[PDB]
Amino acid sequence: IPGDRSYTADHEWIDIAPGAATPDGPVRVGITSVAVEALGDLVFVQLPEVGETVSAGESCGEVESTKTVSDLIAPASGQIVEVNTAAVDDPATIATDPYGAGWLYSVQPTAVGELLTASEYAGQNGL
Amino acid sequence: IPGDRSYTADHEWIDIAPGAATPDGPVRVGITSVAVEALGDLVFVQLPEVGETVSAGESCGEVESTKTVSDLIAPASGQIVEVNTAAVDDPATIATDPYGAGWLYSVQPTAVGELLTASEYAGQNGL
Numbered sequence: 001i002p003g004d005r006s007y008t009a010d011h012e013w014i015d016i017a018p019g020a021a022t023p024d025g026p027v028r029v030g031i032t033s034v035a036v037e038a039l040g041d042l043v044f045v046q047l048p049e050v051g052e053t054v055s056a057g058e059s060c061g062e063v064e065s066t067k068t069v070s071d072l073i074a075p076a077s078g079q080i081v082e083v084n085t086a087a088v089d090d091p092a093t094i095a096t097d098p099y100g101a102g103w104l105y106s107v108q109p110t111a112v113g114e115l116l117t118a119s120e121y122a123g124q125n126g127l
Numbered sequence: 128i129p130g131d132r133s134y135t136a137d138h139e140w141i142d143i144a145p146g147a148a149t150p151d152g153p154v155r156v157g158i159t160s161v162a163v164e165a166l167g168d169l170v171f172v173q174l175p176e177v178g179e180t181v182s183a184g185e186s187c188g189e190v191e192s193t194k195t196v197s198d199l200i201a202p203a204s205g206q207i208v209e210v211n212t213a214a215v216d217d218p219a220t221i222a223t224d225p226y227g228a229g230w231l232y233s234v235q236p237t238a239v240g241e242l243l244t245a246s247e248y249a250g251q252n253g254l
Contacts, residue, residue, distance in 0.1 A: 038165030070195040126254050
């Protein structure tokens with residue numbers, strides 16, 4: 001659980017350093033290693049469209065394994081700027097590298113929901 | 128993670144002790160605390176019917192939160208002897224006590240799938 005980003009109780013991360021101001025630029029969002037182990041082998045991923053406005057705490061897509069369908073819950077309100085199409089196309093990549101090449105989208109934030117540090121999130125997950 | 132029972136890579140348990148002969152009695156199945164953490168607050172459970180024959184590794188029911196639907200994958204082949212109507216009627220009970228009052232059903236096993244010890248299952252999930 002990289003201490004270089006922030007996390008949600010719903011097992012996502014957003015690349016705002018904990019304590020930091022929300023950047024004057026697009027920040028990537030993804031799922032945690034704990035979500036990967038929860039889900040199993042990923043088979044389908046549905047992302048918001050580039051240019052859509054999402055809201056913190058609202059369901060804005062899904063990740064899906066052979067056994068589980070799980071809603072993506074936006075860590076931040078804002079406009080979607082990029083989607084990681086390599087991730088959608090080869091969802092096995094998300095499981096390989098959830099904090100790196102497996103990022104799911106980037107958002108330009110106007111607001112953030114409840115965010116946890118890596119320590120707080122690790123603690124919620126018995127780590 | 129109670130050391131007294133067996134676990135699957137899909138985040139269930141079954142009350143067969145490590146190295147125990149597959150028993151003459153019915154044994155309980157349920158989900159692990161890792162499963163609960165991942166799912167969130169549970170709002171709906173679908174279990175197999177009493178009298179139904181299930182197959183190890185086959186999807187035999189479902190647990191559901193507001194954000195996730197997740198298939199129950201049978202740890203064991205066998206006949207469903209009993210279901211926890213209490214947990215189906217009050218699924219919050221499952222999050223509160225996944226290894227005790229939150230058990231889901233009991234099965235009379237004729238076979239078992241891949242099972243893991245408490246420690247092996249802990250090691251896969253970094254606990």
